Design a protein around this ligand. Structure first.
Ligand SMILES: C[C@@]1(Cc2cn(-c3ccccc3)nn2)NC(=O)CC1=O
Ligand SMILES: C[C@@]1(Cc2cn(-c3ccccc3)nn2)NC(=O)CC1=O
Ligand SMILES: [Zn+2]
Ligand SMILES: [Zn+2]
Ligand SMILES: [Zn+2]
Ligand SMILES: [Zn+2]
Lengths: 197, 197
């Protein structure tokens, strides 16, 4: 009856958060964001994005690491794949670009579990955990993965972002605060057997 | 990068829904339900419940089988474990009790995946996908499993219930209609690679 995946969690104090240069968004506004999505869709079709869920604990309470753009939006570490790029190799590349060290030592990213899929039917904000009715050409497909951290690590956070450890209760039923993907992480993580090391 | 579990789905017209005698609830009201939960907690501690998610398709659109008590509440097939009872053997027993055949031929239930965990902190309706802060003695633990159906089957539905195939869009963000567990099935199912046979 042990059908659950077992995942090792480590204290937040096991991890060192250094700083490095700002990492600027491609798009300077929502309007530019949807213009670029439309231009690239006509060239190379559906956008493929990947996002990593990194979990720690303090005193046996799990927390998800989120990246806050100044004091505005909360984001998962991740981003856009290149055409023909493998999903796992691409998430590892993107997580190195975002949290990789100034001294250029490699993190050992371990990615073994898909935890969800979201689809964007139009060049507009709405996203769903399925392809909606009558939609033959979705504009974006987003894939979420659970990233198993090592016991200790040094991460370099771009100076324009703050790394924040969010407890699950703060995410739960808070789409206004976090939107529909991050707010449903508590439900998506409930199947795992966490070990509090 | 194929980290997803692959699941075979079959058309709803592949399945025959017969009828059998009513199957009556132990508790004739919410108030009796929480009285029995309190009496049993003092004798044998935390209630352990198990629930099965059974998926079909029509024209390549997935649907979850729900059991409607007349025209009131929607339920997953499942129920309460006995003390010392294995979770998987118990869900198989409960699904036979509910949907098992009048002719007494065994269904071949295949249960290979946990899809979530919910906890009830008090003798009250609220349930969460984690144990809330300061709660040392939760009153109920509910475990959800994905049940892989065979290509064809005959199910006997108790005359007091109706079997309904709900498309995912109807569940999504509809807790008033379905409550917080069934309404989050779209998110919990998004990680699977469904084959539409
Ligand atoms: C190509 C790339 C790479 C990229 C990802 N991020 C980022 C994502 C999460 C957290 C912090 C930073 N910043 N640039 N540039 C964009 O504007 C979107 C995108 O995918
Ligand atoms: C012991 C038992 C068994 C049981 C389960 N169900 C049922 C569950 C889902 C759908 C249709 C029927 N009806 N009786 N009696 C109760 O009143 C709760 C319980 O667990
Ligand atoms: Zn401690
Ligand atoms: Zn897709
Ligand atoms: Zn068809
Ligand atoms: Zn428990």
């Amino acid at each position: 009856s042990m059908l659950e995946r077992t995942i090792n969690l480590y204290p937040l104090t096991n991890y060192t958060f250094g700083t490095k240069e700002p990492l600027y968004e491609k798009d300077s506004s929502v309007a530019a964001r949807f213009q670029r999505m439309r231009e690239e869709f006509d060239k190379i079709g559906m956008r493929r994005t990947v996002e990593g869920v990194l979990i720690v604990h303090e005193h046996r309470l799990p927390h998800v690491l989120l990246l806050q753009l100044g004091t505005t939006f909360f984001k998962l570490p991740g981003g856009e794949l290149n055409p023909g790029e493998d999903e796992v190799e691409g998430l590892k590349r993107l997580m190195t670009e975002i949290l990789g060290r100034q001294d250029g030592v490699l993190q050992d990213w371990v990615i073994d579990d898909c935890i969800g899929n979201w689809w964007r039917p139009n060049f507009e904000p709405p996203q769903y955990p399925y392809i909606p009715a009558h939609i033959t050409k979705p504009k974006e497909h987003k894939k979420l993965f659970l990233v198993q951290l090592q016991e200790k690590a040094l991460f370099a956070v771009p100076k324009n972002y703050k790394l924040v450890a969010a407890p699950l209760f703060e995410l739960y039923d808070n789409a206004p605060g976090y939107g529909p993907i991050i707010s449903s992480l508590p439900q998506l993580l409930s199947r795992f057997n966490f070990i509090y090391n």
